[PDB]
From a paper:
Recently, we described the multi-step electron-transfer activity of a designed reaction center maquette protein (the RC maquette), which can assemble metal ions, tyrosine, a Zn tetrapyrrole, and heme into an electron-transport chain. The RC maquette integrates a Co or Fe porphyrin electron acceptor (A-site), a Zn porphyrin pigment (P-site), and an electron donating di-metal center and tyrosine (D-site) for photoactive charge separation. The RC maquette is composed of a cyt. b/b 6-like pigment/electron acceptor (P/A) module and a bacterioferritin-like electron donor (D) module. To fuse the electron donating di-metal/Tyr portion of the RC maquette to the pigment/electron acceptor domain, we joined the corresponding helices together to make an extended 7-nm long antiparallel four-helix bundle.
A complete understanding of cofactor binding requires consideration of the apo-state structure and its transition to the holo-state. The heme-bound and heme-free structures align with a Cα RMSD of 1.2 Å when inter-helical loops are not included in the alignment. The heme-free structure was obtained using a crystallization condition that included a large excess of CdCl2. Several Cd(II) ions are resolved in the structure, one of which effectively takes the place of the heme by coordinating the two A-site His residues as well as two water molecules. An additional water molecule in the A-site is hydrogen bonded to Gln111, and the side chains of Trp, Gln, and Leu residues adopt rotamers that would clash with the heme cofactor were it present. Only one of the two His-Thr pairs in the A-site forms a hydrogen bond in the heme-free structure, whereas both hydrogen bonds form when heme is present. These structural differences suggest that the cofactor binding site is only partially pre-organized prior to heme binding. Given that the a/d core of the RC maquette near the A-site includes two Gly, two His, and two Arg residues, all of which are likely to be strongly destabilizing in the apo-state, perhaps it is unsurprising that crystallization attempts without a stabilizing A-site ligand were unsuccessful. In the RC maquette, the high heme affinity and mostly folded but flexible apo-state indicate that the partial fold option has been applied successfully in a de novo-designed heme-binding protein.
Numbering used by the authors: 1 to 194
Write the structure that this text describes.
C-alpha cells in the first residue's frame, strides 16, 4: 500500500466523482429535452392530417412515453452510484486513519461498494444504449415524413431529436469513461486494502 498507490486511487475516486456529477447533469438535460420533445410530438400528432404521418408520430410518441420511464430508471441508477461513491470515499477515509479495530470488515466494505457501483454503471450504460437506438430510428422516421402540412412543427421535432441524439451519444461516451475509471478504482483498491 504505497503512498503513490494511495494518491493514484484517491485521485481516481475524485475524478470519478466529478465525471458522475457531469453524467448526472447531462441526464437532467436529456430528461428536460425528452419532456419538451413529447409536448411538441403530442401537439404535431393532433395537428397531423396524413395517416402515413399520424402513424409515424404515434409510434414515436409510444417510444417517448417508455423513454421517460427508462430515463427515470437511468437517472436513479446514477443517483445510487453517487450515494455509494460517497460511502466508498468515507470507507477509504476511515481505513487510512484507523488501525486494528477498523480492519477486515471495512476493507471488505470498500471493495463491496466498488463492485456495486460497477454493476450500477452497467445498468446505467444499458438503459442509455437502448434509448439511443430508438432515437436513431426516430430521426430516420421523422426524415421520411419531412415537408408538408405540419412541416414547421416536424422541422422543430427533427431538430430537437438531432440535438438530443448528440447528448445521448455524449452520455454513452462519458459512461464508457466512468466504467474504465471504476474498473481501475476497484483494482487499485484491491492492491491497497488486500
Amino acid at each position: 500500500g504505497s503512498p503513490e498507490l494511495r494518491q493514484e486511487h484517491q485521485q481516481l475516486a475524485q475524478e470519478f466523482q466529478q465525471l458522475l456529477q457531469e453524467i448526472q447533469q447531462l441526464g437532467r438535460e436529456l430528461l428536460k429535452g425528452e419532456l419538451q420533445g413529447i409536448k411538441q410530438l403530442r401537439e404535431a400528432s393532433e395537428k397531423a392530417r396524413n395517416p402515413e404521418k399520424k402513424s409515424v408520430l404515434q409510434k414515436i410518441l409510444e417510444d417517448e412515453e417508455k423513454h421517460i420511464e427508462l430515463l427515470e430508471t437511468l437517472q436513479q441508477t446514477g443517483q445510487e452510484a453517487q450515494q455509494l461513491l460517497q460511502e466508498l470515499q468515507q470507507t477509504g477515509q476511515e481505513l487510512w486513519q484507523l488501525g486494528g479495530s477498523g480492519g477486515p470488515e471495512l476493507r471488505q466494505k470498500h471493495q463491496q461498494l466498488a463492485q456495486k457501483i460497477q454493476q450500477l454503471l452497467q445498468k446505467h450504460q444499458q438503459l442509455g444504449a437502448k434509448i439511443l437506438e430508438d432515437e436513431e430510428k426516430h430521426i430516420e422516421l421523422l426524415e421520411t415524413i419531412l415537408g408538408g402540412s405540419g412541416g414547421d412543427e416536424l422541422r422543430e421535432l427533427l431538430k430537437g431529436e438531432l440535438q438530443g441524439i448528440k447528448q445521448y451519444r455524449e452520455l454513452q461516451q462519458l459512461g464508457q469513461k466512468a466504467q474504465q475509471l471504476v474498473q481501475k478504482l476497484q483494482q487499485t483498491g484491491q492492491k491497497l486494502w488486500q
